[PDB]
């Protein structure tokens, strides 16, 4: 398998620096260029620039010159993008993508969320949304987890270590008046199975290095 | 550099109908040989961008034949002869001929389907959160269409304002529905100050509003 593995979510103070990594797997790192792409709700997708790993040659769109600097390490097959003297406009999701010469962006990285903020990190509390007679419909039951009071975004939520994906709704987080985020993740399951199956929500908050498992019971 | 102007910004389409997205470049994007590196990318939320079309008209491996691209001069078009539920997302044209490379502004494709009524569920606060001094009650609306829905919180028949937050999922990629989660948060003192907690749900698919409720202490 081809893979581009990117580093996890970052919280960085204004005016500081951060380095994003993108490790290639399953192909020869030097045979492809590595490109970087910025994604925001306000500007969509923006090409940042690219590097040729074999020679170290780089190119950038003008506005990212002096803001991004690309490097590559052949010994570890990892491309890097350093973002310097961060402002709030650098909050975004950053992707890496490979390119064979004269081809296309066929494989993309997982993506890295960067939040520029002067506030300190906070890990979430995780509360069960316990199934009951008030959450049954048509022989079916709803259950979930309330992931509350964390900063910054994002949290990743999985169920039963990834063994459960069908029927999952993980909602966009809301910003509470405290300045901390809150989110709900819910799943629809058979009613008959509730006594025999186990349902555990796995919550991971990278910026605070928090991982919480919650078993949800009736 | 080369400006890529995309139109429209949002494209609402019925299931089974035809979709057309236009991309225009400010200057010629023919590379020196007479080949044109015009590409189309799709991004669903929470996911990486995915390649669809390369060199104006060629399909990337695994892209269905109902998706096609064409273009002459500086005008390019992506076409979907029969929109299906999994085509939703943001489409981007991309210019790969002249450094710096550039994207279009994006076109959000939104799918229209038949009305579907929500399934409503309610979750009382967990004992774990109640020990911390706060009580959150969660009302869930699962897989409805269209997107417009009304959640009203009632505490002992008094309509609530100012103490709840909600958010809506992105459109579902297999059944084209939406889901909504609403959270009512009170102090534990105020929560133990009332008996009946209800969310009333109004939606085009319900003939009359649906109430889900519970009495504190069962």
């Amino acid at each position: 398998q081809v893979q581009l593995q990117q580093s996890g979510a970052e919280l960085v103070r204004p005016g500081a620096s951060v380095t994003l990594s993108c490790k290639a797997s399953g192909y020869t790192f030097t045979d492809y260029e590595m490109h970087w792409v910025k994604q925001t709700p306000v500007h969509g997708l923006e090409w940042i620039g690219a590097i040729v790993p074999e020679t170290g040659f780089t190119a950038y769109t003008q506005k990212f010159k002096g803001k991004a600097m690309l490097t590559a390490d052949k010994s570890s097959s990892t491309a890097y993008m350093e973002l310097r003297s961060l402002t709030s406009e650098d909050s975004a999701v950053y992707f890496c993508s490979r390119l064979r010469l004269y081809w296309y962006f066929d494989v993309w990285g997982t993506g890295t969320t960067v939040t520029v903020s002067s506030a300190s990190t906070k890990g979430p509390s995780v509360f069960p949304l316990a199934p009951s007679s008030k959450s049954t419909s048509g022989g079916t039951a709803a259950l979930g987890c309330l992931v509350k009071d964390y900063f910054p975004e994002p949290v990743t939520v999985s169920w039963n270590s990834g063994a459960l994906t069908s029927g999952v709704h993980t909602f966009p987080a809301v910003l509470q008046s405290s300045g901390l985020y809150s989110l709900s993740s819910v799943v629809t399951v058979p009613s008959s199975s509730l006594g025999t199956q186990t349902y555990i929500c796995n919550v991971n908050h990278k910026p605070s290095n928090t991982k919480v498992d919650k078993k949800v019971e009736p | 550099g080369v400006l890529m102007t995309q139109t429209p910004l949002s494209l609402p389409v019925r299931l089974g109908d035809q979709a057309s997205i236009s991309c225009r470049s400010s200057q010629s994007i023919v590379y020196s040989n007479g080949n044109t590196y015009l590409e189309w990318y799709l991004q669903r939320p929470g996911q990486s961008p995915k390649l669809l079309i390369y060199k104006v008209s060629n399909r990337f491996s695994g892209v269905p034949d109902r998706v096609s691209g064409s273009g002459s001069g500086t005008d390019f078009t992506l076409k979907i002869s029969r929109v299906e539920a999994e085509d939703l997302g943001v489409y981007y044209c991309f210019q790969g001929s002249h450094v710096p490379y550039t994207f279009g502004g994006g076109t959000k494709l939104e799918i229209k389907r038949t009305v579907a009524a929500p399934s409503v569920f309610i979750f009382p606060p967990s004992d774990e959160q109640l020990k911390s001094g706060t009580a959150s009650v969660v009302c869930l609306l699962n897989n409805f269409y269209p997107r417009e829905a009304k959640v009203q919180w009632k505490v002992d028949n008094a309509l609530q304002s100012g103490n709840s937050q909600e958010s809506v999922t992105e459109q579902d990629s297999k059944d084209s529905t939406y889901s909504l989660s609403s959270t009512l948060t009170l102090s534990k003192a105020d929560y133990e100050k009332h008996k009946v907690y209800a969310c009333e749900v109004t939606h085009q698919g319900l003939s009359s509003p649906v109430t889900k409720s519970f009495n504190r202490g069962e």
Binding site: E33, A50, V52, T58, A59, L99, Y102, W103 | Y37
Partner: peptide, 6 residues
């Protein structure tokens, strides 16, 4: 794309 190395 062509690539920045061409």
């Amino acid at each position: 794309a062509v690539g920045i190395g061409a």
